[PDB]
Assembly symmetry: D2
Homo-oligomer: 293 residues x 4
Amino acid sequence: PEIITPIITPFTKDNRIDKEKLKIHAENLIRKGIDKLFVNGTTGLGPSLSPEEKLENLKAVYDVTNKIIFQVGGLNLDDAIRLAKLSKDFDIVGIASYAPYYYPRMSEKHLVKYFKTLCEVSPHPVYLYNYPTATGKDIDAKVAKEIGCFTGVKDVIENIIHTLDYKRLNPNMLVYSGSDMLIATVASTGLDGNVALGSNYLPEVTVTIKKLAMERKIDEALKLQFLHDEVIEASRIFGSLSSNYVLTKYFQGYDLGYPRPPIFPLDDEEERQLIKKVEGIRAKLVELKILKE
Amino acid sequence: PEIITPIITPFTKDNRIDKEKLKIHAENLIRKGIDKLFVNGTTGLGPSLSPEEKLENLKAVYDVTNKIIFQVGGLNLDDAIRLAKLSKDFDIVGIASYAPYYYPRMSEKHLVKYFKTLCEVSPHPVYLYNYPTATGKDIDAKVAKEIGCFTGVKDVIENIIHTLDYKRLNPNMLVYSGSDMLIATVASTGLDGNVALGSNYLPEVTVTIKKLAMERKIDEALKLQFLHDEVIEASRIFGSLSSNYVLTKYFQGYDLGYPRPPIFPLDDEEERQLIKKVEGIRAKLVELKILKE
Amino acid sequence: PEIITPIITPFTKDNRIDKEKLKIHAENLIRKGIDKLFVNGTTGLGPSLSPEEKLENLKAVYDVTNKIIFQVGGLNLDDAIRLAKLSKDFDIVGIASYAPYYYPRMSEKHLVKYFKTLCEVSPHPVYLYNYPTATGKDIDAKVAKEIGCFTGVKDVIENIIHTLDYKRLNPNMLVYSGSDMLIATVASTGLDGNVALGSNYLPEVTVTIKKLAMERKIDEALKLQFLHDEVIEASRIFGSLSSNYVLTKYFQGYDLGYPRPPIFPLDDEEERQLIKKVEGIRAKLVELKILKE
Amino acid sequence: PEIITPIITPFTKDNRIDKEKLKIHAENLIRKGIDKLFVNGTTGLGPSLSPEEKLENLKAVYDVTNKIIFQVGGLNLDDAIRLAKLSKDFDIVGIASYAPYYYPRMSEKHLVKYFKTLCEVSPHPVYLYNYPTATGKDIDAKVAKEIGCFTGVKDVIENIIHTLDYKRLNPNMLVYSGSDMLIATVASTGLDGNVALGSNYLPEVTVTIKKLAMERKIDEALKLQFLHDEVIEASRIFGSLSSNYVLTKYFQGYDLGYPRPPIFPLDDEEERQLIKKVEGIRAKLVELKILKE
């Protein structure tokens, strides 16, 4: 199994993509063992990015590695087609799309047309980015089997019965969970890994949870998963998408600038309370020789 | 109270706004009694539009009438501020914004900041576009009071208790329902009216229901409400957002072009089945002398 | 429209039904203008009551009035059949049942059979007690039409569209809402009335809201509705079903004993804290001359 | 890790517990590898049983094995307290209780008081029977810690992060999942086992899944889990609670009578169709030498 990072998109103070900070961040992650990079996902504020900005993220990360899954979805299908086509010249893993978001009660027939249309034009394997809470509809294993063209799926859902069902109906499909709290579980139950936003700021931990599991040292794995669980929670206190920046800078020692409002950055005091929550978990992890002093 | 139409956005074969069909459609809605027009709402596929297209829509409808509320929201706070300020030069009713959509678990603080910010730059009254199902969060009465600067609210929710609470905790606020099926109810329980996608294709009906409720002929108003509900129901089969195009062409007799994929247009078979579903209702509406044979 | 009280079941300290405190309560509710009494409802802890105890409450209230709808449902169908049958010796308004509760994902086919069985054996009209949050399923207008034998429905749901649908699909059916916070609206929109737990402790208020709406004195009907909403909100601090005992003694002046654990009574501190929250409301209610002294 | 059967309560034509069929079923289950027997659970129609019938089920199953967890809860605390005390004389594993069911929006204070009371009176370890979707409320890991006195939890939820959290915050607690579809996952991820309803009719399978996962043959374990998953799906076509009787008679060869209305038994045509849906599976299982022809 693998650990896939839905990479953060660092923005400048004046709301541009800081291509340099993106590259450092991508470089660090590859250095610390991350298998692939998922670009323009939720953790990267993909839905806040223009088609031009989505392409920029690909170009910036393509300098660092070609193990990229390139998210192109949106509510303008022509922008998504143009993006999928422009990836032809990029030797990457595949492209991805989440479902058309916002609009409730969208017909299965219409949703199927959308993903089929991305497959008919894609010059790479096509991954399904399933995130019902964010997009407001579910491409479950049955609908994915009927699309018939996905090479994998990132299932962002608390229900893991739902994630396993993809394998059951598509034995050949790569199945990833999007929950950080299930790295140990995923790795041990026969799935292909985790798209984990927590790997942005603790890639050492998510990678290590994985190893321990494949070594059938599940007891340890859970101990480590649970520490990771506390950090996940610390980030929700103030808004995990904004906390990702503070956490990555705190654990990995470089700046990722700011998010894109209405994803507002944490202020000086929110930053203090967040670090005061994880201060002790950091120490324990240097103790356990998982982080460098 | 008022009927406010969340006006459809017509698209050409080339996926561009059809300015002339928009103006044609806007005229008819004003001439058939609609009080104001909500531009770049859900029914208009607001989220699917660029900021330049959101402004395009305003410029084109202003040609016909200034009784407009201008929706400017999005996931780039800068683009919305720009849009909100550009409205200075239009003598319109207000601007509006849904809460920032897609991203879950957004802090109340971050959500209040997003709206207080728009209020801060706005040269017109600011209206709250509350659509919890489509956006993923609820700017309810307490939070709207906390925000402190809304002139009105459009509450897209089937819980009318939730809607009354706005009037209770904000006595001077205009409180509209976004539910086509409560036009009789809203009018009769002291609320300021409805924002009704259904008024796109049968503005004769939404207006008549409200009038009938004002004259306290509530029994006669429900009878027309339930006929309207059935049309609402029929449009859901193939996707209501697409079907309004068909229905508007069918009941009002001019064409509105295409929706923007992934909001796909009904096909010829789908268009024909919907009409067969509404022929019997149209008959009863002719019978009532609300429509011409 | 009508106000129907879901009458509390008074319990002694020994976990017995206090029949005399009950009769007193019924007498007062009737004397203050309540139209009918709903016995063994949620507010009278029906599901906590045995078949003998339900019948007991019917015998008890029948001593005071015959304007009684008699809930009989349960998870043992032979007990419900018996209660339905035994009601023949009582000249009441009808019987009623919620859907079988607790067990998730019950089949419409089986749910229809449950209710048709009660209709086949019922000596009186049958009322659908629809409470989806409590029973775990929904007997909407479509399933009620299919069942085909309901004289009326009590619809405990935040969604008034859902309630209107019973009228749309069942024009002859008596349609009540079970939402205290919608008494003015229900009355103003052509529905048949409310089943209002808050009429246990403030029947003066609930009846005046109804009357004001019937007179189309809408803003004054809302004024009183919004105070009532504040009492409802106060009751939720410590548990609404237990607070009803404290609130009814406070406003009506006679003590109703205790609820049945695990519906724990409020302790004396809690009782005093809840009364501190409603001293204000009560003061205004005296000023407005809806309550005495 | 263990498989615990939430044993079925078999009823006669006359709606009485068939003590003798329950003992055969009970003996069989233990003998095919079932670890513990959960009595009076959702699958046994717990909420449908009088307290006497809850004690009668214990006395019967106790004649076969002392590996019994004795669920005692209900909406009359005095009955529960007394069912707890009467278990003093049975040398069993422990008692359990779901949360008080039906009544929505109950206070965390009262829910804790409920479980603490049972702990105060219990002569055996107390198990939390957590079933959010049946009871209408959830006792999460956090609350179970507050309550403070649970030896084990049985988490009936399709969300396995929710289940793992009990072990996170309560390391000394036995944590079982209630989902038949996670037997392989639960066993390979370090949790303590499953409360599997489908082990009523295919105990061979649920125990072989478990064995396989313990043996790290995760691929062979999943293939068998996917078989079992289909049987679970087939059981829903008609009412899984009802279908379980048919399926046990089919797979195990002895009839368990009827369920209790309103849990209606399948009729003969429903029996036929259901068997046709699982005939193929019964063949695959005999092919794998898991079942004898």
